[PDB]
Design a protein around this ligand. Structure first.
Ligand SMILES: N[C@@H](CCC(=O)N[C@@H](CS)C(=O)NCC(=O)O)C(=O)O
Ligand SMILES: N[C@@H](CCC(=O)N[C@@H](CS)C(=O)NCC(=O)O)C(=O)O
Lengths: 199, 196
């Protein structure tokens, strides 16, 4: 198939798809958009947002849906419906968490924003990350089913983005950091990290 | 297995799971939580929220994940991974739409303003696209055939209609999809026995 990814010129929600396509070892166009050109491109997307992955000429959006699809293609999904449920539930929970990051990112009042960041760093992150940490510990060192999934790749690629703001944030969570080191050293993901544009 | 669904005593995000369990034709305990008891129950849930579906005692959360799981068990998912992507992408987009709703649900004059953006901007942006998608793709959200996404979509829209009675009336293909789904025998039977 042909693959063309459109996203902004940073990691964000494009990166899970880039990592999955790299893991899949397929060529793909990495179409990156500057923030300056976004009001132009916005009206061209199916629902006004990126990422968009064009597969054999058909535009598909939603980072999670696409990651799962590529995960199936990659052999990084479940062996049965229950195993896929174990992956899906963790990523939907992660996406509930990262909604908090989005609220903080889009706040225009600086003092409120500082208040969101405080709540985020001292209540929200511990609440979710202690559970994620305990879950990974008790699930074989992975998000789900004791084995590598597209969920692990989605989780780590997006957490890496957080490390660009709060650099130490995942360090104290031993099992999150252990999954992080494992994923970024998958050879094709490692390669992508080495060759990817480094803003 | 045994199934126990815990959610509040209204439709909301529990209703897609109730509809899917009904469509699956399996017995389940419909554990409907009153707001008064929610502070007690909240700490017992995996991540502080409902719905929670207990499957032979194991707690699973996340309404979309559960609906997809039950969808696959019910023969209402895709025939291949492309077809499953077609369902999954529409529902994640619908969940983006829903996210705008959730903020309203969370001062009665600032509520009145959030509600004007929802009805006047957010709803028309999304529902025009959903309506035309359904129109030009066989009368369903994905792949020209009934999926768990249709169930999820219509059940949550039905709950939105209990607040904004005319919200889908101008979207004739959405309304038509609604009418198809709620007249499915297993669904219809649920709608008749559920709390008023
Ligand atoms: N649920 C969507 C969220 C996509 C999304 O939020 N895209 C943002 C960038 S991360 C965007 O397009 N912002 C530009 C805008 O909203 O105009 C997904 O997971 O792909
Ligand atoms: N992504 C979750 C969202 C769950 C959610 O937002 N649950 C709300 C009710 S619809 C809740 O439990 N509110 C009570 C609380 O947060 O204390 C899902 O789809 O199940």
């Amino acid at each position: 198939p042909t693959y063309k990814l459109t996203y902004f010129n940073f990691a964000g929600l494009g990166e899970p798809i880039r990592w999955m396509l790299s893991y899949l070892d397929v060529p793909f166009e990495d179409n990156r958009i500057e923030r300056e050109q976004w009001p132009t491109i916005k009206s061209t997307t199916p629902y006004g947002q990126v990422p968009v992955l064009e597969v054999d000429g058909k535009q598909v959006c939603q980072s999670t849906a696409i990651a799962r699809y590529l995960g199936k293609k990659a052999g990084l999904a479940g062996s049965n419906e229950w195993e896929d449920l174990m992956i899906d539930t963790m990523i939907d929970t992660f996406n509930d968490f990262r909604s908090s990051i989005s609220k903080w990112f889009r706040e225009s009042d600086e003092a409120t924003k500082k208040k969101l960041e405080e709540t985020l760093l001292n209540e929200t992150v511990p609440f979710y990350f202690n559970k994620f940490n305990d879950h990974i510990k008790n699930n074989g060192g992975y998000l789900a089913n004791g084995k590598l999934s597209w969920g692990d790749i989605y989780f780590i690629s997006i957490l890496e983005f957080m490390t660009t703001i709060w650099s130490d944030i995942i360090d104290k969570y031993e099992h999150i950091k252990a999954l992080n080191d494992k994923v970024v050293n998958l050879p094709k993901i490692k390669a992508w990290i080495e060759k990817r544009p480094v803003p």
